[PDB]
Amino acid sequence: GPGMASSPRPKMDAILTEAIKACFQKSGASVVAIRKYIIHKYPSLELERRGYLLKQALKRELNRGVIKQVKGKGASGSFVVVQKSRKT
């Protein structure tokens, strides 16, 4: 585009979003799940292992409401609670 020196948008956010949404139900999503994922799935685990990016994201949900809330409770897609408890 019009302007050299540029960096793409982050993706790790969705990579883990898939884990909580897709995994939490199929395999379950916990602090270890995200950690072991960075460790086993990626090399970045060195820095990430400090549960900085992943734990903050995974735990931010848990710390917010036990990661049992994907969407809002009204204006959003109705009362939603992950795949394990994806209400209607």
Right CATH for 1-88 from 1.10.10.10, 3.20.20.150, 3.40.50.740, 3.40.50.1000: 1.10.10.10
Per DSSP, the three-state class of 41 is helix
DSSP tally for the chain: helices H, then strands E: 5, 0
Residue 62's closest CA among 79, 82, 44? 82
Question: In a 10 Å sphere around its CB, with 0-12 CB exposed, 13-18 middle and 19+ buried, how is residue 4 labelled?
Answer: exposed
Provide the residue ranges of all domains of the chain, joining segments of one domain with +.
1-88
What was the experiment behind these coordinates? NMR
| Dihedral Cα 3, 12, 53, 72, nearest 10 deg | 110
Q: How far is CA 76 from CA 26, 58, 69, 70, in A?
A: 24, 21, 11, 10
